[PDB]
């Protein structure tokens, strides 16, 4: 498996960003994905999720209504749309996979994190 | 002993296909459901197997994506829907279920359907 | 919203020292927790799934046990390679909120 | 008795049973979103079960004359299935605890 | 997994045939998990032998054959002329439950 991310920026003051993370080495269509951020020196936070079929997308309280997520199985790659950028949006965003646990032939999702990519540090200034 | 299939349907090339199969004359609670692919001047391809009692199914090298099943336990039924139709999707799906009553039954597939005639066109 | 606290803050232990990390959740999240080990400059790696099970590839030294309000990650032996941080994760319902994190030092 | 999976493959109510039953909704308190690991079906029984007995023995169900030796595939169907519930269903799908 | 390529092709003999058919397998498949469906032109297929060890309850007689895992043989002893149709081998046990290529016959 190999998770690769791109879409960094020296400065993005209130601009539009299109981050892209690709999944290779495992089935992209059989799993859901998460976008999990990390502040420059603080703990771990989650901003966006995408379902296996793309129907269900959920965000944080301060993230919903301004950011967007999407995916594409043709390229096996998924995208994050970043709009309404402030000066406190500097973080290190990662693109990760859920855990699908098989019990009695049924796959349970949204239980934990298994594979993490290198990640991309997105910063803003004045 | 009597298995019936829905009438042939004309759909759009790439939306979805869903065929209704109903059974009567034997217990549907403890049985199995499978699906077939046949065409004129063509060989037989087994699509997948559906267990109505417990949700469990597996796909061949072609049906991993764009296919999902639905229990439809009411009225002794079970559905499968296909998405992203291609040009070579004109085939008779058919459907069958073994004659089982008691807990143990026959191994082979005896009761068969009549199939449909879905021609993927305009 | 669900708020969870991870204790302690920062302690030092090395070689043959047993350490305990407590994870207290505001609500009763049953056996729905995952324990991670995030290096200071590397992406977090999962050590405990289902809050009681051990993810394949993780050494047997790390142990996890708990339910509802309280969870515990216990390490009997701290070999000088676990110098990282440990995080919980609650996933009963959206949204996902994480704790502060616990750091281990070498004596 | 009645019909259905209850009292046929699940726990069976004895004839002339004496005692009370109390049922209550369990939307929360160990019932979260998605399919939980536990709380799975108990089906595919060759018999109709007996009163007051508990079936703990799990085995691959037999759907043919020849029984398999531990390989999953044709016939040999799983007698269990997890409950695909969630706390966001309607009125007839919420988890309910019965004592 | 699919290298069957059944040996017989198109047979054209008068009633009184004593020929035999064979189903090939890539690897040795355990017995009691084989099938030979009898497909018909414009009609739903039937089943005659299951597992190459017995017969169904009620079906036409005068033909019964069995073979090994590598080569499953079957013989016919003067079958009725109306039973001149396509035969489809089928293996069970290991998914996918692929069928056979098929064989053609002539009067």
């Amino acid at each position: 498996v190999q998770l690769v991310e791109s879409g960094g920026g020296v400065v993005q003051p209130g601009r539009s960003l299109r981050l892209s993370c690709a999944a290779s080495g495992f089935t992209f269509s059989s799993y859901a994905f998460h976008w999990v951020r990390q502040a420059p020196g603080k703990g771990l936070e989650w901003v966006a999720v995408i379902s296996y079929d793309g129907s269900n997308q959920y965000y944080a309280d301060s993230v919903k209504g301004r950011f967007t997520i999407s995916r594409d199985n043709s390229k096996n790659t998924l995208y994050l749309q970043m709009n309404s950028l402030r000066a406190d949006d500097t973080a290190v965003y990662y693109c990760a996979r859920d855990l699908a646990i098989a019990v009695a032939g049924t796959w349970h999702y949204y239980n934990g994190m298994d594979v993490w990519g290198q990640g991309t540090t997105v910063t803003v200034s004045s | 002993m009597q298995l019936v299939q829905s009438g042939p349907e004309v759909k759009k090339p790439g939306t979805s296909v869903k065929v209704s199969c109903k059974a009567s004359g034997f217990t549907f609670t403890s049985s199995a459901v499978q699906w077939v692919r046949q065409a004129r001047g063509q060989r037989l391809e087994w699509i997948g197997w559906i267990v109505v009692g417990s949700g469990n199914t597996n796909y061949a090298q072609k049906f991993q994506e764009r296919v999902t099943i639905t229990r439809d336990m009411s009225t002794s039924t079970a559905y499968m829907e296909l998405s992203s139709l291609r040009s070579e999707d004109t085939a008779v799906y058919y459907c069958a279920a073994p004659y089982c009553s008691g807990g143990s039954c026959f191994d082979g597939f005896d009761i068969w359907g009549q199939g449909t005639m879905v021609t993927v066109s305009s | 919203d669900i708020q969870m606290t991870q204790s302690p803050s920062s302690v030092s232990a090395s070689v043959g020292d047993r350490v305990i990390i407590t994870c207290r959740a505001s609500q009763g999240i049953s056996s729905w927790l995952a324990w991670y080990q995030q290096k200071p400059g590397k992406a977090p790696k999962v050590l405990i799934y289902d809050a009681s099970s051990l993810q394949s590839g993780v050494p047997s030294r790390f142990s996890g046990s708990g339910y509802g309000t309280d969870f515990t990650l216990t390490i009997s032996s701290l070999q000088p390679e676990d110098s990282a941080t440990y995080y919980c994760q609650q996933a009963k319902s959206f949204p996902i909120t994480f704790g502060q994190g616990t750091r281990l030092e070498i004596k | 008795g009645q019909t259905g999976k209850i009292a046929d493959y699940n726990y069976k109510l004895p004839d002339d049973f004496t005692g009370c039953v109390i049922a209550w909704n369990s939307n929360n308190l160990d019932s979260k979103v998605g399919g939980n690991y536990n709380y799975l079906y108990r089906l595919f029984r060759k018999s109709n079960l007996k009163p007051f007995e508990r079936d703990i023995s799990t085995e691959i169900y037999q759907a043919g004359s020849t029984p398999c030796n531990g390989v999953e595939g044709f016939n040999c169907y799983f007698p269990l299935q997890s409950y695909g519930f969630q706390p966001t269903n309607g009125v007839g799908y919420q988890p309910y605890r019965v004592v | 997994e699919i290298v069957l390529t059944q040996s017989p092709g198109t047979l054209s003999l008068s009633p009184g045939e004593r020929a035999t058919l064979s189903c090939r397998a890539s690897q040795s498949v355990s017995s009691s998990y084989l099938a030979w469906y009898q497909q018909k032109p414009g009609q739903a297929p039937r089943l005659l032998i299951y597992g190459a060890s017995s017969r169904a309850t009620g079906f036409p007689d005068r033909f019964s054959g069995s073979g090994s895992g590598t080569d499953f043989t079957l013989t016919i002893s003067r079958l009725e002329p109306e039973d001149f149709a396509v035969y489809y081998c089928q293996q069970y046990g290991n998914s996918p439950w692929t069928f056979g290529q098929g064989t053609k016959v002539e009067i």
Side-chain angles (χ1 to χ4, degrees), chain C residues 24-83:
Chain C
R24 159 178 307 274
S26 299
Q27 313 186 8
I29 62 172
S30 283
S31 60
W32 311 318
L33 197 78
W35 289 85
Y36 297 81
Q37 178 183 317
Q38 170 177 180
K39 299 211 86 70
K42 290 187 199 310
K45 318 171 292 293
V46 60
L47 295 194
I48 294 174
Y49 76 99
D50 210 6
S52 296
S53 313
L54 188 152
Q55 183 66 41
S56 181
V58 179
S60 173
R61 312 157 305 187
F62 304 95
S63 299
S65 69
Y67 196 91
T69 308
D70 280 337
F71 306 91
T72 300
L73 161 70
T74 299
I75 317 166
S76 66
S77 178
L78 293 175
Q79 275 288 94
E81 69 254 11
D82 301 328
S83 177

Side-chain angles (χ1 to χ4, degrees), chain B residues 34 38 42-44 46 49 58 60-61 94 106-109 112-113, chain E residues 37 39 43-47 50 55-56 88 96-97 99-101 104:
Chain B
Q34 81 162 357
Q38 193 74 261
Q42 191 62 256
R43 309 314 182 189
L44 200 152
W46 170 87
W49 59 293
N58 299 317
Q61 52 264 9
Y94 271 110
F106 202 67
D107 296 75
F109 293 163
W112 291 87
Chain E
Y37 291 97
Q39 192 257 329
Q43 302 164 329
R46 328 208 319 274
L47 183 73
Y50 72 115
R55 204 193 272 177
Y88 282 124
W97 317 347
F99 278 66
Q101 183 179 2
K104 304 284 189 181

